Write a protein that holds these residues in place. Sequence first.
Motif, PDB file in Angstrom:
ATOM      1  N   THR A  57      11.634  -2.651  -4.769  1.00 25.09           N
ATOM      2  CA  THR A  57      11.826  -1.765  -5.928  1.00 25.09           C
ATOM      3  C   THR A  57      10.764  -1.449  -6.833  1.00 25.09           C
ATOM      4  O   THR A  57       9.565  -1.973  -6.314  1.00 25.09           O
ATOM      5  N   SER A  58      10.671  -0.303  -7.784  1.00 23.38           N
ATOM      6  CA  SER A  58       9.672  -0.046  -8.426  1.00 23.38           C
ATOM      7  C   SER A  58       9.299  -1.092  -9.170  1.00 23.38           C
ATOM      8  O   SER A  58       7.866  -1.153  -9.218  1.00 23.38           O
ATOM      9  N   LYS A  59       9.699  -1.738  -9.849  1.00 28.82           N
ATOM     10  CA  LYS A  59       9.145  -2.956 -10.748  1.00 28.82           C
ATOM     11  C   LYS A  59       8.340  -3.761 -10.054  1.00 28.82           C
ATOM     12  O   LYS A  59       7.492  -4.254 -10.527  1.00 28.82           O
ATOM     13  N   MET A  60       8.608  -4.052  -8.754  1.00 31.19           N
ATOM     14  CA  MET A  60       7.713  -4.764  -7.763  1.00 31.19           C
ATOM     15  C   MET A  60       6.521  -4.181  -7.562  1.00 31.19           C
ATOM     16  O   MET A  60       5.607  -5.085  -7.485  1.00 31.19           O
ATOM     17  N   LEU A  61       6.440  -2.878  -7.567  1.00 30.88           N
ATOM     18  CA  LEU A  61       5.114  -2.252  -7.315  1.00 30.88           C
ATOM     19  C   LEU A  61       4.458  -2.319  -8.527  1.00 30.88           C
ATOM     20  O   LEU A  61       4.655  -2.660  -9.728  1.00 30.88           O
ATOM     21  N   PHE A  62       3.178  -2.770  -8.360  1.00 27.46           N
ATOM     22  CA  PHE A  62       2.172  -2.998  -9.365  1.00 27.46           C
ATOM     23  C   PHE A  62       0.685  -2.137  -8.792  1.00 27.46           C
ATOM     24  O   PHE A  62       0.580  -1.658  -7.601  1.00 27.46           O
ATOM     25  N   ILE A  63      -0.150  -2.266  -9.914  1.00 35.20           N
ATOM     26  CA  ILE A  63      -1.409  -1.127  -9.722  1.00 35.20           C
ATOM     27  C   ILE A  63      -2.489  -2.226  -9.990  1.00 35.20           C
ATOM     28  O   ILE A  63      -2.347  -3.006 -11.123  1.00 35.20           O
TER      29      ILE A  63
ATOM     30  N   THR B  56       9.358   3.092  -2.312  1.00 35.97           N
ATOM     31  CA  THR B  56      10.415   2.273  -2.478  1.00 35.97           C
ATOM     32  C   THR B  56      11.528   2.366  -1.450  1.00 35.97           C
ATOM     33  O   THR B  56      12.064   1.331  -0.942  1.00 35.97           O
ATOM     34  N   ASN B  57      11.588   3.406  -1.079  1.00 37.77           N
ATOM     35  CA  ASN B  57      12.683   3.907  -0.185  1.00 37.77           C
ATOM     36  C   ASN B  57      12.291   3.585   1.282  1.00 37.77           C
ATOM     37  O   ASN B  57      12.947   3.485   2.370  1.00 37.77           O
TER      38      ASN B  57
ATOM     39  N   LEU C 292       3.828  13.270  -9.059  1.00 37.05           N
ATOM     40  CA  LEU C 292       3.712  13.046  -7.753  1.00 37.05           C
ATOM     41  C   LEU C 292       3.380  11.619  -7.381  1.00 37.05           C
ATOM     42  O   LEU C 292       3.776  10.931  -6.403  1.00 37.05           O
ATOM     43  N   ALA C 293       2.893  10.994  -8.563  1.00 35.97           N
ATOM     44  CA  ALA C 293       3.045   9.354  -8.617  1.00 35.97           C
ATOM     45  C   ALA C 293       4.726   9.140  -8.502  1.00 35.97           C
ATOM     46  O   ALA C 293       4.841   8.009  -7.914  1.00 35.97           O
ATOM     47  N   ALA C 294       5.369   9.795  -9.079  1.00 35.32           N
ATOM     48  CA  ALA C 294       7.071   9.394  -9.118  1.00 35.32           C
ATOM     49  C   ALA C 294       7.496   9.669  -7.759  1.00 35.32           C
ATOM     50  O   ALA C 294       8.090   8.762  -6.968  1.00 35.32           O
ATOM     51  N   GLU C 295       7.065  10.582  -7.100  1.00 33.97           N
ATOM     52  CA  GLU C 295       7.498  10.935  -5.590  1.00 33.97           C
ATOM     53  C   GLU C 295       6.758   9.778  -4.789  1.00 33.97           C
ATOM     54  O   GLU C 295       7.571   9.438  -3.903  1.00 33.97           O
ATOM     55  N   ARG C 296       5.692   9.283  -5.072  1.00 35.01           N
ATOM     56  CA  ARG C 296       4.943   8.196  -4.323  1.00 35.01           C
ATOM     57  C   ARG C 296       5.782   7.084  -4.575  1.00 35.01           C
ATOM     58  O   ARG C 296       6.108   6.356  -3.505  1.00 35.01           O
TER      59      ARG C 296
ATOM     60  N   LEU D 137      -4.379  -1.814  -4.993  1.00 41.10           N
ATOM     61  CA  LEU D 137      -5.631  -1.622  -5.731  1.00 41.10           C
ATOM     62  C   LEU D 137      -5.910  -0.276  -6.331  1.00 41.10           C
ATOM     63  O   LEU D 137      -5.348   0.650  -5.686  1.00 41.10           O
ATOM     64  N   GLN D 138      -6.214   0.126  -7.462  1.00 45.07           N
ATOM     65  CA  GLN D 138      -7.038   1.433  -7.872  1.00 45.07           C
ATOM     66  C   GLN D 138      -8.338   1.075  -8.364  1.00 45.07           C
ATOM     67  O   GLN D 138      -8.581   0.359  -9.295  1.00 45.07           O
ATOM     68  N   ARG D 139      -9.368   1.834  -7.726  1.00 43.14           N
ATOM     69  CA  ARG D 139     -10.431   2.110  -8.348  1.00 43.14           C
ATOM     70  C   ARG D 139     -10.620   3.225  -9.158  1.00 43.14           C
ATOM     71  O   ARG D 139     -11.628   3.585  -9.879  1.00 43.14           O
ATOM     72  N   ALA D 140      -9.748   4.259  -9.134  1.00 41.04           N
ATOM     73  CA  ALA D 140      -9.882   5.252  -9.781  1.00 41.04           C
ATOM     74  C   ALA D 140      -9.535   5.290 -11.239  1.00 41.04           C
ATOM     75  O   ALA D 140      -9.125   3.996 -11.871  1.00 41.04           O
ATOM     76  N   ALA D 141      -9.688   6.244 -11.829  1.00 39.21           N
ATOM     77  CA  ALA D 141      -9.420   6.045 -13.582  1.00 39.21           C
ATOM     78  C   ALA D 141      -7.924   5.910 -13.807  1.00 39.21           C
ATOM     79  O   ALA D 141      -7.260   6.262 -12.923  1.00 39.21           O
ATOM     80  N   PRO D 142      -7.758   5.129 -14.861  1.00 38.86           N
ATOM     81  CA  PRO D 142      -6.499   4.752 -14.860  1.00 38.86           C
ATOM     82  C   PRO D 142      -5.339   6.000 -15.060  1.00 38.86           C
ATOM     83  O   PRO D 142      -5.735   6.950 -15.830  1.00 38.86           O
ATOM     84  N   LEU D 143      -3.943   5.776 -14.572  1.00 38.82           N
ATOM     85  CA  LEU D 143      -3.167   6.789 -14.747  1.00 38.82           C
ATOM     86  C   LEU D 143      -2.304   6.641 -15.870  1.00 38.82           C
ATOM     87  O   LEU D 143      -1.585   5.568 -16.135  1.00 38.82           O
ATOM     88  N   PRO D 144      -2.041   7.692 -16.703  1.00 33.78           N
ATOM     89  CA  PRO D 144      -1.019   7.727 -17.849  1.00 33.78           C
ATOM     90  C   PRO D 144       0.300   7.826 -17.211  1.00 33.78           C
ATOM     91  O   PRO D 144       0.710   8.818 -16.593  1.00 33.78           O
TER      92      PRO D 144
END
Lengths: 614, 138
Positions: free
Chosen positions: A156-162, A150-151, A141-145, A128-135
């Motif tokens: 996988t990344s594609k499985m991740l959703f917001i 994922t590891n 840091l989102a990449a590191e997240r 879930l995100q209640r914050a403002a949308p991320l570009p």
Amino acid sequence: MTMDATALPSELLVTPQPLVGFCGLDTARVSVHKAVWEAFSGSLQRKAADRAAVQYKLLPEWYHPKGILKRNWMLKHLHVLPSVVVLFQDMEWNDLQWTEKQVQCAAIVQALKNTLQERNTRLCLVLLQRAAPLPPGEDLLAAERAASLTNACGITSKMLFILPHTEHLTGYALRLESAFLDMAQSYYALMSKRIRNHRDQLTAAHTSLKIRHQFKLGFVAEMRQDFSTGQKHYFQAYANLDEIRINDGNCLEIKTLAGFLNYKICRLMFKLKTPRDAINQFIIHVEKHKSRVGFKDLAFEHHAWLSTQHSVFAELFCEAIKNGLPALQTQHPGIYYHKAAEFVMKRRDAAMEAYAAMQASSVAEQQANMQLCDQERSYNHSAAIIALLSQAMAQFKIYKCLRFRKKLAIDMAEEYLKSGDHAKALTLYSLMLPDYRQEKWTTIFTDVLLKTLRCALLSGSVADYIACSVEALSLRHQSDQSERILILENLWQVFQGVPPMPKTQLTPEAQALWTSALANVKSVEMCATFERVQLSNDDLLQLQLIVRVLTDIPLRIRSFHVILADAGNPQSYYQLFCSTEAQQFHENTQLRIVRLEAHMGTDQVAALLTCSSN
Amino acid sequence: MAFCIAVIGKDNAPLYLTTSDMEQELELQYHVNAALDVVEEKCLIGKGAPESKELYLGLLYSTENHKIYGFVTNTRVKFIVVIDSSNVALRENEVRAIFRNLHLLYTDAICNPFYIPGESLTSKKFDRAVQKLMSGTA
């Protein structure tokens, strides 16, 4: 092998649909998650096609097959294993909370995948995100997240959703629906691959396993909206069931399997707009099964199952109507309802002699038959007849049918009599006489009349009793004469309060019934003959009406009254001295008689064959 | 092969004997067989049970061991025999011939001037006509 293939009655009577589940959560996270949940149920709010077919569970000698061996494994295949699992937290970039949630979410999804591996359900991660949308492309840091999570679990990344806010959450819940559908379908195709690679091998001609495989793949196809491969498999499983010729008295398991797959195939037909196919299937099957049994036949057999089978098929018809298939209705709307009803009547009868044989005496398995007897004693309610005929009557009315509803209504009333609840039976009969009288079918009319009199006497509804008795009098030439006489004398008795003589035919309770009554109850065919209608200025009229009596046994000559008709101004044959009219009034006067006020033997007829104008 | 013969008037039934080839119809559905007819009308009537044609009704109504085959004339008379055989090797052709025969026998009972139309068939002659029909084609 030796155990039953499947033992679940009314398996997935509901439309099978995709099922995604996820872990149980406390009230406050679900409190934030509310809007998401009714966003999910908006599909229920929206039209069913707009609804994604998925559903939400929200949880906390060849070798035998895996996941297919058992009927409980099967029931697990229904719902216990969602084809998609999604772990729910909020995605929220933070400073220290970010790391904390990383560690905890990683560990929990780790355990979750440890659980999900063998059951092969893939575990998609949506946060879930209640914050403002991320570009995207802005935060490393989102990449590191993404990398760390994922590891953390191999997802996988594609499985991740917001999960964004509602204006976006709507479309993203919908695309979530799509992704869940896709991966569930991939799972189902894989599981079917399992089934087929099992199917290539055989346990030396058991073919029960083969039936299980077709039925499992029926789950699969039904689930995936294929609707076709599953029904083919059902056909083949039923066929190989047939090639298994019945070994012994264990026909019941065969018949139950037959009923299961029979429901499946018929409803799947109805899904495909193939009504003729379904009709032919169900008939073929039911008479096959009629021919199936030869012995034991404990009268539990062949009756309950057949009635239930007809019941289910009418239910499938109603499903079809909900779909909109009127081809089967225009022929006959409620076909198997009253066949099922007659079968449950036969079942009660069978129970009667099943009792009787149980009184005969009662060394192996006999106690089971005893508990069988007791359980069907529980079934002696037979109000199921009433419910089945209720549905039959409604459905018959649906195609503008009066008599089948009328005849099944007489069946309802007669079983009410067997129920002892004669009150409702007499209510029905009271409604049912008029139509028979208009119908003029002189055979049936008296046939229901004798029963209607029986209900009146048992109920003690002396008003209806006398009315039906006098209508019987009017034309009672079909029955025996002395019986007509007894009816008439009983009638006079009850008009002046005397109970009827068939005392042995009556019971003390009913004695109380009609001794109690008459507190409110108050007040042969002949003709009115007026010599002069359209009166002039001066005239007189005496007894010109002629009271013909169609009954043989004479009406006793004591008294009579005619009430002066208000038309205009308020005012073996027997001809006598009564002669009411002897005065003068205004001309152009006509007359018309309401009722006889028949004080000959009786007080009054209470039934309107006192014609006004013939 | 019970042919519950039943001529019907406009609404009511003038003659409906209970006979077949061998002997009388024991089965106690008679008055409720006429009730089968009152569901063949007011239900299985549709807009169709009366027509302006010599009426072929190959199984306007069917049920176990009881199959209704119908006929209607311009005078609104309902002609119905029942095929009380789950199946026997007789095909509808002789059924058509039988409704021809029944048509003719009924209308030749009609040929009486004394018998008022719409009343119970008094003719023991039209009886034996129906009786030969039953003894032959059942």
